[PDB]
Write a new protein. Structure first.
Ligand SMILES: Nc1ncnc2c1ncn2[C@@H]1O[C@H](COP(=O)(O)OP(=O)(O)O)[C@@H](O)[C@H]1O
Ligand SMILES: Nc1ncnc2c1ncn2[C@@H]1O[C@H](COP(=O)(O)OP(=O)(O)O)[C@@H](O)[C@H]1O
Ligand SMILES: Nc1ncnc2c1ncn2[C@@H]1O[C@H](COP(=O)(O)OP(=O)(O)O)[C@@H](O)[C@H]1O
Ligand SMILES: Nc1ncnc2c1ncn2[C@@H]1O[C@H](COP(=O)(O)OP(=O)(O)O)[C@@H](O)[C@H]1O
Ligand SMILES: CC(C)C[C@H](N)C(=O)O
Ligand SMILES: CC(C)C[C@H](N)C(=O)O
Ligand SMILES: CC(C)C[C@H](N)C(=O)O
Ligand SMILES: [K+]
Ligand SMILES: [K+]
Ligand SMILES: [K+]
Ligand SMILES: [K+]
Lengths: 499, 494, 496, 220
């Protein structure tokens, strides 16, 4: 995929270089210290020089015994980009295409992703050079457990050191094996041993709302910009999801959830694309009907309430285009043909920097992956917090909140019944059907959804304010990288460098 | 060929030789194909470096500017903990260089029975471009980054100085570790070797590699079996030698061989060479190089045009640089013994020519392990928290005096009142040993015992696998046999 | 007879504690009344008697066929007056909490008599190793180590296990490897968590011969003492001494080899299935080679087949080097031997001990004689703490001093007499030359064991004279051990 | 009482055996893995066999000095039924009727009691074989503190390892002494040292509503 593409490693480096030169001049004049103007330039440029490269990169070579008895030496890597926030955070990829450069580029990208959504972790990324399709579940458990042991001994796993997560190639059963190995061996004496890894099953300390997390983040990211009338009038559109049409490229976990949440708020799905074929219906595509067909047949091709679209969904006449497939699909060759006004990156690096130039020229707003694709990172922070807390969210306050709500309604009821007397009869103040469902179904997922919504709302306004401060307009990607570099710089500047 | 490819090829050669003997020596409840897989599978685990750490740490120059420094540290094996290996400060350091030297250290430790796995660090800077204050900052910060990732610790990884590093850097590494993360460790100062005496260093560290080169040559030169093959007499009597590279190793090797009767005919250096068939005094040459900076212009020696490698002598000691003896100059070497007092001075293609010409090459794996041996003793000294002999020198002296007094009192009874008093007193040489009894004596003997024991192990391995004068292959087979045994008997976790 | 070995050890302690009690009160110099001193002494002895900690385990294992099995395990730590605790691991379906507790308590007193600074401990995994593959036994050993480590029942400074007749050096190696790579990863002494390890894993040279050499040195110290030998109507030394060994195992073979080396003649060797006898003498090397090629000593060409047990053989020294409770009150009045050297734990019942005292038959107890292996396990533990083999830095130094000593005698004599009849070469003997050339760690371990057995024999002899026990060496050994364990408690005090 | 009755230990074992055979067949078909049907039966039955017994049982023999000066050796036990959830949780009983079987049965009962109310702790139970009526408040402090020390050294007390609690024979003051000994000795460097034991007074870190807790639970 494009997270394994060498062109994507150069892209993330270029995004940092662009943002660092923009933020540089403002960081010098904002610095109030006993230094000359050339001493201030060296301090700013020098800290940004520290931020750019990966602080640590560990290369491993560990043994494994196959189920047939033969031995195999496995290659592995883990890069920790920055420790200005500890622990480090980042997924583990099981692919024969993993490399040191890939692991370093994705580690750097996680530093700036966390920074835009105010998630207090440094960037990190691991890669085990194996094809999981070639191994038994028993062999994959041995690889996972041995890899965890090698990381733990060298400080590349730990609740306060480095917290890995699953990728597209790894799942919740892998994360469970990592947590179990750690809590049983090196982290045995640690009360927060299970906070060493996120993406764990519910039985092992995983948060509710992890599966929907990236899709809800894509929804909230779009929602924050679509409701802003300032940006929408620039794109020649009305604010809100009313009379909005959208197309999703990639019907995976992110694609399905993004389609479900936008449809729930009034938007109409015009076309859904996939690796093998595309589907299109201008009248509308129901996400629940499409989900049931995809689960029963394996593919969206052949959906009864949609015609087969010949080609990519990227050029469908819609308002919002959501690339939910991790591929450099929007390039300079197809950017002048995109009929959408908003491009919502629900995957890492779906648009090339040359296409970005064309979208800016065409007044097409691209909400960047750095912000929009940070919903899963946000709830991984909540999972890490849940494990530190050793309690599910709301466990001690759902009933308390429910009683206070009933007291507030009974107070309005008595107050009014007193004002109008017994002649005006009883005035029953009861919860709505929707509020009654919320009270009865009150669980942890309700708080994880709220924390994610608050994070996406707060970060959208930060990116909007950074865009106005540096006069970037519709260049939201540059605003996001400048926002992230500004935050990382501030930690280094106020903490200082030891020795 | 690259030195990193060379050490890999040495391992591959030794692993295929030892493989068949490791299968039949294995007594377990397995089929013959299950035994082949177990041996080949364990050999596959040993060959690559287990861990490699790449660093990028900040530094603030004395002028105020910031600089990001690159650094690496490879831990080739942990079959023996801690890992051991030097730190190089050079702009020419690389991951491959650090990996090759880490693997080489694994096998080098194994041949001299030093219980450490191999390791090697490299900081990509030119020390000539930095002040002593800047070098202290780089050293302290590098130590902190290694410490947080398990690449320095008394029981984890013990670094050492290199040609680009000194005892003052080691002192800063030990102080940084003991004052920050290793504060709660009683053995914190055993985290690094090569330290000054005031910081917990062993006496005899400076002479260690030179003494090892001497003892390595001494063990083979005094073996009549090998010497008759080379058409030579055993011992250093009537032996002529030439040293290439007049550094710390070159100076000490020349001094110790001369002390035992060997005559130095030629001394080579980076810029020029010196030659005198009548003999070159090591003390006179040492004083001239310390007063002038170079050996060129030595009054009791003519200026030799070219490398010392082709001088008509018996023992050639390349005590400096990598790949000096190559396939192009090997058919012109007049020496019958090539004592490698540096890492990788002869290419594998030159090794083939030396075997064809019946020229015995004592390998770097064994001969250049004197410094590694006393670094083990320094690590032990720090764990002991006492200098060697501190509580037994006086006790030993009094026991010696009682022994001589017993011989005297017994002989005076046998010869009674006619042979008067028969004073049994120590010789002048023994009296000097008693009076000058210090730690250095125990380190020197501990190193001599290691070189003697390891020479016999290599000789026995050479006879077992019928290698003859191929001592390098014997040394790698000896090391692979030892590392394999640790893995086979311990097992692999998970 | 057949008393429970657990009850035996308890009775030995009770006997020794009541003997030492009166002497411990008058030796106590403190600001207390005489009844306060009696309570303090009796109170400390009440603390020493029972096991301080006993851990019962139930851990999972996955068989090679895929099925799961829950394994039972135990480990008792009798005392922590000396840390770490020390004690073997038994893999047998016959292990029990009482067995593990009795052997742990026995180990405390065994260590105390040989001045080995460890408290007593003993583990037992309730499995029959014959029913498991080498892979399954690895899993059991590694998992058992993990469960002990997490609860403080393994560690270089907490508890150091060792092999038993049912476990070996490969299991010890797996224990060390599991500890060094999981819980004890950050510990510099992680390989000192277990003893009985192979040489490649940090084992001492001389471990295999250790118990046999200890049996030899134990007998040697009493056999050379003319005071004790005249009581038994015998001459001092191994000259004209005949001996018989019950059980031809590791202890039996080595004890037979070392006694024969010093002049003693082996008249009979017994085994689980049959016995061998030759009054002219049995060569230990010839018997060892036949036992390694056939499996059993039955059919040895230079020995007739003896019908019955070797305990009733006409010899001077009887050595029960195998089995428990072999000498009972029913066969004690028929022992023609005059010295019974216990090469195994609990081979004679307390009722047989009474008969041997009545018959003036000296029994050297297991508490002392069977402590050779414990002594070198202490040296292995120290070797791993030292991180160096014994003599590594001093063999060459010692060798040079020896040359200088002989050269000083030669040069001093050459000055006194001159070269009238030539030079007077003072060179080493053939035996000294062999010692110099073969100088290795095993020589220092053998010396350390010999010094320990010599020192402890004199301590037991002095205790026997102090309390007028005579030939009751077992009571002398338990009184010696209780006196030492009490002293540690009395001078340290009890926390809270 | 009923918690010391041998018939109750057999009772709990039977409840587990009944539940394990009922849940067994449904656990095999719900398992979606790359295994044969006999490999799935062994995996389900093997896990059930692991759950049933107590993982660890520690037996103690610790000294105590009575107020009159005499010494006494106290017997004690602590079983940790399961560590699928850490820390373990369970009360401490001070009774001459405590036994290894009682401590094992109540530890196992605790595991299932915690799982039904989604409390993330494994089962545990301790018993000190003494009659508190025979000891002074000073002697009971010594017993409590020394028992705490013996459990702490062997991993049978700690906020992330095992968190004891009171029962009908122990109180909040004993819990307060347990926390105080742990915080001032073994857990001195632990920021959550006072979380090693529950049932503590309010001044020592106890929750409000502990006294009414069982009664409100019965009501709800
Ligand atoms: N990954 C990060 N790197 C740098 N700064 C960060 C990071 N995450 C958050 N910050 C910043 O650090 C500060 C944390 O303050 P706080 O109010 O506690 O956080 P928040 O309100 O974002 O949860 C904020 O200024 C926030 O923007
Ligand atoms: N670096 C090493 N790797 C593997 N085996 C080693 C290493 N160093 C020593 N050994 C071997 O381990 C064993 C250690 O046993 P010991 O007698 O204590 O050591 P030594 O006599 O060499 O000091 C010997 O067989 C020795 O050859
Ligand atoms: N296991 C033990 N239990 C109690 N006391 C012991 C034990 N081992 C040794 N001692 C005693 O402790 C003291 C240790 O003193 P030290 O002279 O250092 O020992 P040693 O000379 O026996 O090596 C001696 O009195 C010794 O007899
Ligand atoms: N003691 C326990 N043993 C096993 N599973 C438990 C235990 N306590 C809780 N669980 C389960 O573990 C999961 C924990 O998920 P989470 O939602 O964080 O917990 P909860 O909502 O119960 O507070 C739930 O499935 C819960 O039923
Ligand atoms: C932001 C800080 C954690 C940076 C740290 N002080 C350093 O020296 O790199
Ligand atoms: C020789 C041992 C240190 C090997 C170790 N068990 C490993 O898995 O690497
Ligand atoms: C001898 C000491 C280790 C005794 C210890 N103070 C205890 O209370 O058991
Ligand atoms: K950085
Ligand atoms: K390796
Ligand atoms: K005790
Ligand atoms: K259990």
């Amino acid at each position: 995929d494009r997270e394994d593409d060498p062109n994507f490693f150069k892209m993330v480096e270029g995004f940092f270089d662009r943002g660092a030169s923009i933020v540089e001049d403002k960081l010098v004049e904002d610095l109030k210290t006993r230094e000359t103007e050339e001493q201030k330039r060296n301090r700013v440029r020098g800290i940004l020089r520290i931020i750019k490269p990966c602080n640590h990169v560990l290369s491993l070579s560990f043994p494994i015994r196959r189920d047939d008895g033969s031995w195999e030496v496995i290659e592995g890597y883990r890069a920790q980009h920055s420790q200005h926030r500890t622990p480090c955070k980042g997924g583990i990829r099981y692919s024969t295409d993993v490399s040191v450069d890939e692991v370093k580029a994705l580690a750097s990208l996680m530093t700036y992703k966390c920074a835009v959504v105010d998630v207090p972790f440094g960037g990190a990324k691991a890669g085990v050079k194996i094809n999981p399709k070639n191994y038994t579940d028993n062999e994959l458990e041995k690889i996972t457990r041995r890899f965890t042991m090698e990381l733990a001994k060298k400080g590349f796993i730990g609740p306060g050191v480095d917290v890995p997560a699953p990728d597209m190639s790894t799942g919740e059963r892998e994360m469970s094996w990592i947590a179990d190995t750690y809590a049983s061996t090196i982290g045995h004496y640690d009360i927060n041993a299970h906070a060493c890894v996120t993406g764990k099953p519910i039985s092992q300390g995983g948060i509710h709302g992890r599966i929907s997390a990236t899709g809800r983040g894509v929804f909230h990211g779009i929602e924050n910009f679509i409701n802003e009338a300032s940006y929408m009038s620039i794109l020649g559109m009305t604010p809100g999801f009313g009379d909005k049409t959208f197309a999703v490229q990639g019907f995976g976990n992110v694609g399905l959830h993004s389609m479900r949440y936008l449809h729930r708020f009034g938007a109409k799905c015009v076309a859904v694309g996939e690796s093998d074929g595309s589907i299109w219906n201008p009248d509308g595509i129901d996400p629940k009907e499409l989900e049931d067909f995809k689960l029963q047949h394996g593919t969206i091709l052949g959906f009864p309430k949609a015609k087969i679209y010949e080609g990519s969904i990227l050029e469908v006449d819609c308002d919002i285009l959501i690339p939910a497939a991790s591929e450099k699909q929007l390039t300079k060759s197809n950017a002048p043909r995109v009929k959408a006004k908003i491009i919502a990156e629900g995957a890492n690096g779906p648009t090339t920097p040359e296409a970005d130039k064309i979208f800016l020229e065409r007044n097409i707003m691209v909400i960047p992956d750095l912000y929009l694709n940070a919903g899963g990172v946000t709830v991984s922070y909540f999972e890490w917090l849940k494990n530190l807390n050793h309690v599910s969210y709301g466990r001690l306050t759902f009933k308390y909140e429910r009683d206070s709500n009933y007291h507030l309604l009974m107070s309005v009821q008595e107050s009014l019944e007193r004002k109008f007397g017994k002649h005006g009869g009883t005035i029953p103040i009861v919860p709505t059907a929707e509020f009654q469902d919320r009270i009865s179904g009150a669980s942890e997922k309700d708080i994880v959804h709220s924390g994610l919504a608050y994070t996406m709302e707060r970060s959208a306004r930060q990116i909007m304010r950074t865009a106005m401060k540096y006069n970037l307009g519709l260049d939201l990607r540059t605003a996001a990288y400048v926002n992230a570099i500004e935050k990382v710089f501030r930690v280094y500047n106020e903490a200082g460098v030891t020795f």
